[PDB]
Amino acid sequence: MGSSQPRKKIFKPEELRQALMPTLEALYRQDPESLPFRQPVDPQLLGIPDYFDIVKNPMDLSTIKRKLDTGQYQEPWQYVDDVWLMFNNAWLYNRKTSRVYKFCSKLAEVFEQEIDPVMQSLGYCCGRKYEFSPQTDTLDPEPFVDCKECGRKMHQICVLHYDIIWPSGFVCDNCLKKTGRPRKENKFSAKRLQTTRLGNHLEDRVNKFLRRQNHPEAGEVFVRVVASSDKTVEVKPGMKSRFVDSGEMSESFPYRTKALFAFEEIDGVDVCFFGMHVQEYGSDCPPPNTRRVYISYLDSIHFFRPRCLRTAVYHEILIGYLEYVKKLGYVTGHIWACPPSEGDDNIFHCHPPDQKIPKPKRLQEWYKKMLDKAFAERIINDYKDIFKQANEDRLTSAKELPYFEGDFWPNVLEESIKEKLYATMEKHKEVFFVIHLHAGQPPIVDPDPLLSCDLMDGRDAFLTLARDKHWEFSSLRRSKWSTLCMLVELHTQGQDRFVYTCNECKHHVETRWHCTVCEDYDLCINHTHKMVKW
Ligand SMILES: CC(=O)N[C@H](CCCCNC(=O)CSCCNC(=O)CCNC(=O)[C@H](O)C(C)(C)COP(=O)(O)OP(=O)(O)OC[C@H]1O[C@@H](n2cnc3c(N)ncnc32)[C@H](O)[C@@H]1OP(=O)(O)O)C(N)=O
Ligand SMILES: [Zn+2]
Ligand SMILES: [Zn+2]
Ligand SMILES: [Zn+2]
Ligand SMILES: [Zn+2]
Ligand SMILES: [Zn+2]
């Protein structure tokens, strides 16, 4: 039952009383807001019988003062926890409209204002009591990591320590500077993730843009394709009995799905801010889907450091994609511009509450804004809504409009099972976009291999994992931890197991040479660049 920290930091009652008293004093200094808290709550004075059936562990400034004065706190966190218990009791019994609730919120704002730097000066991260967002009476706490050398407990998310990266345990920032050796660099980074021709093109597109701007807060951006696989869309049994039972359209359609993410350095750490799953139907795919792409899902977390260039870099990513698929041989883009349902996430588990979900018109206008700039850039020849293309290119049969996986139309055709379908086309005409890469020969060849990654094969896997692991994207601090964890998941959970080969030799070798300039220059001496003995 007993533990052993020989060099553990203990605070004498007067050392913590010296440091924690200013913070408690600042609360008492707030008149009249601290007045219903300066003494314990009295249900007989207030006519509130049910108080002790709601608040089970009462707390108030006076009890916290008595504990502080008579040294009943051994380490700061017991003080910190008791104030938040008093605050949490007020937010509980008193309604959000209440004066006491507002009074409590003011005290809490001043507690946050003072407690953070005092805890920081005493070798801690912050003085806040954190909890995870509710899922599905009782909430989940934030994890803590105890310093190996000093024993000081810290919020795991504050300090960004994950064991799988640093297995020698966690040692606090100041302990490392007492020895004179800085922390061991995180190798599970976005920059280190497997480079792909597509991702490189997209990150060049955004890095050249912000290089031209030279914005102060702007951090380096990394776009990586984390999963790439060959999937198949099977035609639904309804439309299958009308066109597949004959020979008008194929029973299935081949596409390559690719999940891809965008990351940026914020305070020297990787923060993920953009997600996107696409469907690419190649040259050997039967009609209608031949040579077309389809943005299946897209998501974002608004913590992009220079908040001004935020939508400029989202648009530059979306435009770099179209410049890429077009260049290698695709002809039409397809976006179902629909926002997510209330309280539902596309890719990133827990969105920030202060992050505004655009209205369907705003989303259409945002996509519209992106496409016009790409037209001027001479990437997209032209674009039109689904109705202005089914009547310009003359469509009369169901088999003529593209059939994508999880798209609206493949499921709406199944609804017309008892019977007007061209009438549904102009109702939602602004939602569906048809992009033209070419106006009007050799087959497509994706140079990139296939990234096998179960977590990014479909949105559901990453969304469910983060939900169980509590990897939220609700705060910048919480997004930094969720990115830290998702990067180790993509690294360690790497389903692809490599077999390296040399370039000029073309042999499967174990001992090799790798220069510090090219992307993957492996060579067998059995070139101008300086090689490394790997
Ligand atoms: C059956 C079924 O399940 N069916 C489903 C159907 C799924 C359909 C398939 N979906 C797709 O294919 C994807 S199309 C896009 C989907 N939506 C999303 O990506 C999620 C929303 N979040 C975002 O990623 C971003 O908002 C983004 C779209 C990237 C635009 O970035 P932004 O930078 O432009 O921000 P803003 O929020 O638009 O607005 C930018 C400004 O507008 C402000 N703003 C935004 N919305 C509002 C608003 N509501 N009220 C007031 N202001 C508002 C915001 O505060 C801000 O201001 P500031 O510049 O001062 O900061 C199924 N199959 O699963
Ligand atoms: Zn903390
Ligand atoms: Zn320490
Ligand atoms: Zn700006
Ligand atoms: Zn060789
Ligand atoms: Zn080289």
Automatic annotation (TrEMBL):
Segments forming domain Bromo: 29-101
Subcellular location: Cytoplasm; Nucleus
Entry superkingdom: Eukaryota
Domain CBP/p300-type HAT: 187-495
Domain ZZ-type: 497-534
Protein name as it appears in the record: histone acetyltransferase
Protein source organism: Mus musculus
Record gene name: Crebbp
